[PDB]
């Protein structure tokens, strides 16, 4: 046998980089069933696969589209081993920019798939691993699931939304032998979507001046962050490798202890004050 | 003139008292226009105003369901104003359950209303707020949007995405003169919904046998933490109010400092382990 892992969110970044790290470990410990929204984005995943010659047969692609619950059922059905070791939810949207410039459907879709998602694959995985008395889920966090950041207010509150959804769940799932981790990401090179956000134009045109000029800032602020502190894809896929070996499982696991100090100062200070001023700072110079 | 206050959710419990609280308010300093999902819910707030003598014209009630952008653009409309000086994000829903036994329009609602419900009222009124250079918006918070909770999952999920939407949305908006805070409730002495949770029967026919125990034991534990810490709706209501006339607000304001010490425990070990492990013994003994 092997470990059956089904991973949401393959196309590209930590999922696809993860399916082939598993598929393609040394060990063959894994069978991974790589599943994507659209399986005409399997491309990169088949070829990064190649690159790493994972073994015919440790990698699969599903067809898994976590807004619908038809779509998880269906890639789970697909699971031959009838059973899947470790669940990892990745499938996410990011949205970014000003509050009042985003579409209310870009909005509900963060939610739907990043949380509404997730919480879809849970129902469905979860109730066998509890019977097991076995499996782990692993999905993935972000920093911004830890500490507000301007201009990804939807995106925060979806990461936000999955520290309490996870966070919950550990509490409950704690002596049926489920592990549930959260593999807290910071900034990781990835170039993947996103970029339906908007032109400066369109978002401009649907917010001020001054929270446009803002999201300016903001952005030239990320992308220092990401040109200081975006981690390989292989590292913090590796970080989920961790959490999968781990006996005893955290809730969470952090890709960097980069932004641990940031983090620090929400809980020194309940009000957020603290944190909102030194964020503030922190990004707007 | 006045401080004219838009709350929603105001059909009962937090929402209905504070509206109520403000319309009343000794000083009639406010206006306050109580929105309710559905308007045929509007008497207890009319019994509650009339109740608290509030002033004819103190308080109207609009409908306003956090679902419908139209709903809530239509509401904006309706401030005979042409501003809102606090907007209160309180309408919400509940959902407990284990997470496989919720369903999953239930699911979808609850984010739905708690995060892009409140993420539509504030596209809908900041843009004005900013542009006045003022504004408060409280919202309502949740200890459960700081912890997880078991067979909260989604609660909790909804309620942490408003922690993860206000902070983001904090931090842009500090130099805009538009505050935003979050008052952190705990439990709140409020008969309302919520009992469209699942009998059970229903309950236990869509979970596993150990999953509903704990599911008592839960329901259990949560009765008792009711019973020895839920707070009146007019305490609450009146940390809303001492947010509003806070000349430099705080992103949280806690109704109580309860559940701060298992809050700190979170930030103590960012692993979450502890938090976890003292949060099962919590709930489940
Ligand atoms: C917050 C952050 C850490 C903290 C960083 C920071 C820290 C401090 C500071 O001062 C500033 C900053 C700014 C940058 C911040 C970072 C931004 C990074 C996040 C950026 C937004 C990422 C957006 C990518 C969203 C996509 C993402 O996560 O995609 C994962 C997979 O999901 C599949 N996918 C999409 N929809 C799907 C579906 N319906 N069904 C199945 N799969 C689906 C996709 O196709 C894909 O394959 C990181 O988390
Ligand atoms: C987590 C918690 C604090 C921590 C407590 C704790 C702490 C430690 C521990 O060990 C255990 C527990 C267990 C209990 C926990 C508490 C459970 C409490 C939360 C209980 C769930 C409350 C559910 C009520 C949801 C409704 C709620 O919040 O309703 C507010 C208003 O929203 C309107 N409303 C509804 N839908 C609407 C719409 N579409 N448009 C407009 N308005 C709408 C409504 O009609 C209403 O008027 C509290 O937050």
């Known amino acids: 046998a092997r470990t059956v892992v089904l991973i949401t969110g393959c196309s590209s970044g930590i999922g696809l980089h993860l399916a ?29 696969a190649r690159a790493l010659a994972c073994p015919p047969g440790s990698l699969e692609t599903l067809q898994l589209d976590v807004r619908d619950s038809k779509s998880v059922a269906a890639a789970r059905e697909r699971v031959t081993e009838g ?128 929270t446009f000029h803002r999201f300016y800032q903001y952005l030239a602020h990320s992308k220092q962050v990401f040109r200081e502190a975006a981690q390989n894809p292989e590292e913090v896929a590796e970080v989920f490798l961790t959490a999968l070996r781990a006996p005893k499982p955290t809730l969470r696991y952090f890709t960097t202890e980069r932004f641990l100090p940031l983090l620090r100062m929400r809980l020194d200070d309940p009000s957020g004050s603290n944190y909102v001023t030194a964020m503030h700072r922190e990004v707007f110079g």
């Open 20 to 48: 082939v790290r598993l598929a393609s470990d040394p060990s063959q410990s894994f069978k991974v069933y790589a599943t994507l929204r659209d399986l005409k984005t399997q491309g990169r995943l088949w070829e990064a």
């Open 83 to 210: 059973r899947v070791d470790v669940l990892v939810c990745n499938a996410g949207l990011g949205l970014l920019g000003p509050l009042e410039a985003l579409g209310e459907d870009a909005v509900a879709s963060v939610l739907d798939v990043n949380v509404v998602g997730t919480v879809r694959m849970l129902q469905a995985f979860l109730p066998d691993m509890k019977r097991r008395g076995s499996g782990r889920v692993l999905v993935t966090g972000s920093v911004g699931g830890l500490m507000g950041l301007p201009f990804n207010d939807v995106y925060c509150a979806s990461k936000f939304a999955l520290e309490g959804l996870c966070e919950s769940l550990a509490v409950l799932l704690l002596p049926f032998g489920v592990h549930l981790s959260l593999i807290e990401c910071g900034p990781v090179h990835t170039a993947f979507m996103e970029k339906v956000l908007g032109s400066p134009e369109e978002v401009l045109d649907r917010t001020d001046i001054h």
